[PDB]
Symmetry: D2
Subunit: 386 residues, 4 copies
């Protein structure tokens, strides 16, 4: 009954189940978790692996010796459990030095520091076997219009990513980058605010093939955007390297609810898309167990993430396998959407009097699309009412 | 006192001052305007030119002879007034045949019809001297998840734009395309919903150099996005071919208020950016005089569009010329943002102990950015309080 | 399998299934429906009754004789089918004369006309047996700040409703009023924009007992508000006289999707609340079959409204009857929320050293609320995964 | 040139200029401020007074002796500066014990503790001379639907406020309560989310005359609502006891920008309303100097709050005094909006054939409202372009 196994490729950030519950208006409600205990508890729940920021694993300002002891304890817990580390990232947002950004801070010496902090963790990530390195520029942005010339900032952002690309290729590392967009919070506006802006930016990098996106359900929904649509565009471009799964109730602060909470029907269409397109990357949960919860609630919340994915996967598969749904898809001409508009070419199109001069516009206009019957079949399948 | 001349390059769509005031809940409050009268009235107000959809100028379903008479009357009014036609577009949204889209309609015969309708108006646009051809895919999208496979739809969208690009190059036309994004309305979600998604899509076209964006103030703000930031990214990519100016009060239906209404400070930063970057295209107003207004209100509203642009232009120029502002920009290190992070290169950066090993993180963290003083200087300039 | 009967009290506006599909950017896609056919088709689907604006039933500007013939045909179809008319309303928004409002139009003669148009339809509503009379002030509002002094407008709004209350009581009519809030569209901002503002306004009327609210799912969600929470406040105040059910995907134009579409989990909690509180009024659907649909799609969409209500009703009832859920509610102390804080009174509270001086704040802080386990049980029940 | 004096009644919370810059993703960027220094610095800037939560002034868990020393130091600084304390409030949100609320926490013993903590600070507030006591229920709410029965929670909320009302009247205190609404953050949804919901709730209290609202600019704008409209409804009801001034850029996390930032035109219409209605309460700024700023930026930001109010006050006064504006107000029939619709009464209205039978609907429909000319005059005045 919806039990995960490591083959389902579910992963969690250390910072997720480890969130102590400090928010802008309140103190922590839970004690800190040792990374080692987190790995053990997640392995017992059926997770495939964990992810980390450098500063989750190695307390900021550790000596090189303390650093090695922290990595050794962590590696021992990975070996003890079979857990993998498919993704790593850099914390370029917590420390006060990053208050105006890392890669696009106005101060040049902060920008250089941000690059050196990132490069050091890329080495560690490769050693632990990470395949994707995520960059979330949470502090890259502004609260006021004059504080940031955005063209210069984009120059600085491109420079930083180009330099990281030169570093990995000069080291022969097999790692790819994924940019994680967010429209706002903690800055008033964040640069590269959506999947689309990030995809557009990547095409201006020196080595675009090394970069993709790491979209997050809740972040696109903070702009009121359709998350499955954005994921479809990222797949279409070949750029879906990683994904952050969670829940969000509309346009407000980033809630990071467990996956399946928030917009349930969007979660259904997302799972349908990922499974139909054969996405094979990690199913990563970037979520926060609400600060109302004790530690038993934390693990119930993490378990719920995986459970909801598996239930939705079953319902989406039943939806697509149902002969009556396959018939309704043809009734709505989804098969025709997949056929070329003009494989015959431009000149044939221009000579085709059935496409314009003799096109029966009123007859085509009268045909219903039958979309509502199709959508009610999808509802019936989601609710198990079929 | 803020009087426009044709050198200011202000343009208006025929559909703007010609909007009869029909909304989803009410009938028209104004009679229709003859395109010829609109050209004359706008010329008297100081406008530079007009834009049109095919169906604004030529009633849908006109014979070829009636078509020629409509164009002739229009051309005579352009010659009488000196008005230019810098942009044209296709109406692929009003007629019922486009209820599920034009370029991405599920029905293949509608998609072919949409292409032939567009190609016919490209010819007319070139004859009238338009330099930019805008495409707003207002019906390309969905209300439900199963109605549209977005990867197939993007295939169909790319196919359509590739075919238009083949047509203009095979005809030797000097015209470029601009895609106008909108997140929603009249479809529940529209494909290519923001500037960013449109920029990303263009990079997958066969001839990307022929395509740019036509962002609209209100459309990006319907996603809660920062419009000057999005414009900066479009300029950075070299893709700002055209712009739609209006006003919008936040995340709600597309209001199309006169420019300067809605988010006043965003309008100030937009004008500052366009004028500082040397944007030389038309300043096009895509706005709707509210249906409360009679015809005297329509022309007062159109006049207000141009007036507000000119006032904001004056205030932005005073802001940037003020020595105390130039000093505050240096205090906030905007000059350092414009300098390369690591022109010395990757190896020099890696060897630079001042960038990491000996970087004084606490000292850099203590420096204030002085952004609030800078933003209050900008406020004082906007309000004429200096 | 989820079949409605008239005992379920499902009702539909004539304007819902009768929506021709005209939106701000397109012409009608469906022919008009005769009110008589609509009554017959809805009766066959299992509906309990219909609602109407005066202008849905009687074409605007009909002579008194044509008026009587229209009512007679309608009454004959009600008798033929057994359909009831539980609610009626006035169209104070379509005709151009209402472009600046009805009850709060700046022009006094329009305000008087709006009152006479309303009073005439109250008579008709009582004759057809309506118990609730709805007022949706769709044009009461403004696009700009100086156009409407809101204190004077609220004076005019109170005056209008006070006069309607005097009319019904002087006629001895057994009818109550329900105000339907909406935050925006078609005006830039609408007066009484949410359930809360409407409830507050009612308490200033001369006869508050005659007035309640008619909240609509999508309207509260256009402000990002929690619709079940708002309904709970209306029930708490004793003011839920009527309800408009539909679906909405977040903060954007009013979509009026079929009920169950949009925010599915909000629909579940709404049905749970209405059924648990014993709401006995009509379950009224104010929805628009998308303009992609032909007439077969219209009736499939209407059927889906009722189906989704019945499925959600079953799942909510199973949720509340599940012993493991009843246990989890006690684990989360929902039983304690229902017990008075200080039935012992103020002085006992002040003397109770266990409430402050000797309260163990750290122990109380450590208790988890177990909300995530509870919410996953609700998810499992909604998805039929239990 | 726009210099404040204590007669302008500008006040600041200790928590505003004292915000250390900790947000959900970062550590503090500024050291803590001694309340005494804050009073001195604000007095030098021209402020009239300060406000406080109990826990801003007295560190949580202080002994009764340390408590007295903290109050004594504070009182000495008030006497040294002439600063007043017009408002006080309780912190029922920071400590982990309040993670599920104070007055509406599911645990009864937490609810009793919350009441005793509040009552203790009411005594202190009266001793310092506060006239208004604010309650912001930031933790009263839920992230999930089953966690909170809202009808029971409203029962508990009413019980708490009724008990506070009994306490102040039994002590003979001259203090009034103001409820501060917020739609969300830090809870997923907060009870009483807008001005309207709060006004409606007050009317169910035992002693409604003791309670009013403390609206905050940014909070109503987090629901996309028109803040001047909401303030007008609160004034109309006689319930505007206090106000929180700041800035907010649309629907997103609560930014608490300095007043004048965010929606500039809304700030203009707000100042016009407050000054025209003769609001005489404090002009309180609940704002956060951005964490990019050092202490010089903090005081520049606080100074900007007062400056922007004074500039807007000047522009609104010029707008209302301009004869051409007074003429345009009559052209738009604002004078008619202020006149009764039917002072002649119901029977006269029903007998008046000019109101319906002989009303010229087409003539009334043709009259333009001239709202756009009026709004451009307001724009010209705001920008100093007249
Ligand atoms: O960059 C990795 C992560 O960093 C932070 O935790 C962000 O909140 C999250 O969105 C991001 O994915
Ligand atoms: O495509 C040209 C225009 O068409 C329609 O009028 C749209 O509303 C507008 O946004 C667009 O710019
Ligand atoms: O007033 C009755 C109805 O009128 C209009 O159709 C509105 O769109 C709807 O919201 C309202 O309920
Ligand atoms: O209750 C007083 C204050 O408490 C908190 O600081 C809130 O953020 C603010 O909105 C409120 O006004
Ligand atoms: Mg997030
Ligand atoms: Mg996130
Ligand atoms: Mg993330
Ligand atoms: Mg628009
Ligand atoms: Mg537009
Ligand atoms: Mg446009
Ligand atoms: Mg609606
Ligand atoms: Mg509605
Ligand atoms: Mg309705
Ligand atoms: Mg706030
Ligand atoms: Mg606040
Ligand atoms: Mg506040």
């Amino acid at each position: 009954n919806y039990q995960p196994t490591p083959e389902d490729r579910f992963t969690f950030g250390l910072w997720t189940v480890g969130w102590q519950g400090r928010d802008p208006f309140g103190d922590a409600t839970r004690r800190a978790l040792d990374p080692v205990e987190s790995v053990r508890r997640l392995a017992e729940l059926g997770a495939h692996g964990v992810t980390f920021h450098d500063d989750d694993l190695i307390p900021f300002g550790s000596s090189d010796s303390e650093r090695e002891e922290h990595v050794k304890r962590f590696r021992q817990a990975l070996d003890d459990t079979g857990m993998k580390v498919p993704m790593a990232t850099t914390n370029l947002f917590t420390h006060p030095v990053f208050k105006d950004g890392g890669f696009t801070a106005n101060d040049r010496d902060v920008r250089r520091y941000a690059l050196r902090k990132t490069i050091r963790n890329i080495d560690l990530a490769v050693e632990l076997g990470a395949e994707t390195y995520v960059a979330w520029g949470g502090r890259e942005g502004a609260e006021s219009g004059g504080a940031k010339d955005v063209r210069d900032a984009l120059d600085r952002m491109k420079e930083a990513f180009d330099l990281l690309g030169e570093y990995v290729t000069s080291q022969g590392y097999d790692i790819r980058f994924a940019i994680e967009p967010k429209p706002n919070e903690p800055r008033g506006d964040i640069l590269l605010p959506t999947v689309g802006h990030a995809l557009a930016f990547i095409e201006r990098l020196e080595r675009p093939e090394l970069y993709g996106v790491n979209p997050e359900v809740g972040h696109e929904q903070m702009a009121g955007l359709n998350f499955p649509h954005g994921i479809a565009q990222a797949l279409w471009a070949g750029k879906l390297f990683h994904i952050d799964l969670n829940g969000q109730n509309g346009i407000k602060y980033d809630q990071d609810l467990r996956f399946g909470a928030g917009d349930l029907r969007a979660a259904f269409w997302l799972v349908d898309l990922l499974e139909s397109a054969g996405y094979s990357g990690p199913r990563h949960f970037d979520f926060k167990p609400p600060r109302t919860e004790d530690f038993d609630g934390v693990w119930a919340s993490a378990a719920g993430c995986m459970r909801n994915y598996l239930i939705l996967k079953e319902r989406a598969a039943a939806f697509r396998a149902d002969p009556e749904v396959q018939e309704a898809l043809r009734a709505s001409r989804l098969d025709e959407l997949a056929r070329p508009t003009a494989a015959d070419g431009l000149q044939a199109l221009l000579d085709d009097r059935s496409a314009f001069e003799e096109f029966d516009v009123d007859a085509a206009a009268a045909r219903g699309m039958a979309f509502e019957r199709l959508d009610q079949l999808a509802m019936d399948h989601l609710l198990g009412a079929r």
